[PDB]
């Protein structure tokens, strides 16, 4: 009855009004309708779920959706996007190199 620390979104790079794409052969993403970024976090931290342990994700505030990316705007074979009301959540411990 109190996730308190459960939410891990406080460890990702927060960049609202900013999202990311992908152009490399070994780079995909994941999407799930949702309510707020806080949610994506729990759904992003829980490893053993994303092929990339969810290194970064995004929350569409006008679409209440989630988009976990295996990388961040720093990764390669990839690029950043927008969405007006999206959200960029790149885990700092996973910031591609």
């Amino acid at each position: 009855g109190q996730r308190k620390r459960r939410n891990t979104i406080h460890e990702f790079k927060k960049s609202a009004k900013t999202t990311l794409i992908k152009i490399d052969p070994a780079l995909k993403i994941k999407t799930k309708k949702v309510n707020t970024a806080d949610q994506c976090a729990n759904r992003c931290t829980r490893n053993k779920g994303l092929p990339f342990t969810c290194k970064a994700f995004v929350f569409d505030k006008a679409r209440k959706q989630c988009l976990w990316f295996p990388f961040n705007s720093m990764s390669s074979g990839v690029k950043k996007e927008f969405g007006h009301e999206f959200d960029l959540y790149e885990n700092k411990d996973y910031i591609r190199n």
Side-chain angles (χ1 to χ4, degrees), residues 26-66:
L27 230 85
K28 270 294 188 147
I29 352 156
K30 188 97 68 189
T31 24
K32 163 193 304 285
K33 279 190 181 187
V34 119
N35 238 274
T36 47
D38 280 318
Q39 297 264 212
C40 234
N42 268 0
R43 230 287 153 226
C44 176
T45 0
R46 292 242 162 214
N47 304 343
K48 190 179 157 223
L50 297 315
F52 33 96
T53 283
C54 202
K55 306 190 124 191
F57 57 90
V58 166
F59 164 69
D60 224 356
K61 303 164 48 140
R63 267 311 200 156
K64 257 48 56 114
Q65 270 190 183
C66 258

Side-chain angles (χ1 to χ4, degrees), residues 6-17:
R6 234 110 275 187
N7 286 352
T8 11
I9 180 147
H10 305 295
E11 323 172 340
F12 293 75
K13 218 254 222 225
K14 178 72 269 225
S15 255
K17 328 223 105 157

Side-chain angles (χ1 to χ4, degrees), residues 51-82:
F52 33 96
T53 283
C54 202
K55 306 190 124 191
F57 57 90
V58 166
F59 164 69
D60 224 356
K61 303 164 48 140
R63 267 311 200 156
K64 257 48 56 114
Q65 270 190 183
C66 258
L67 285 106
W68 302 284
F69 281 92
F71 44 81
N72 3 103
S73 71
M74 264 268 300
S75 142
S76 260
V78 85
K79 293 200 142 234
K80 258 187 49 174
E81 251 165 347
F82 188 7

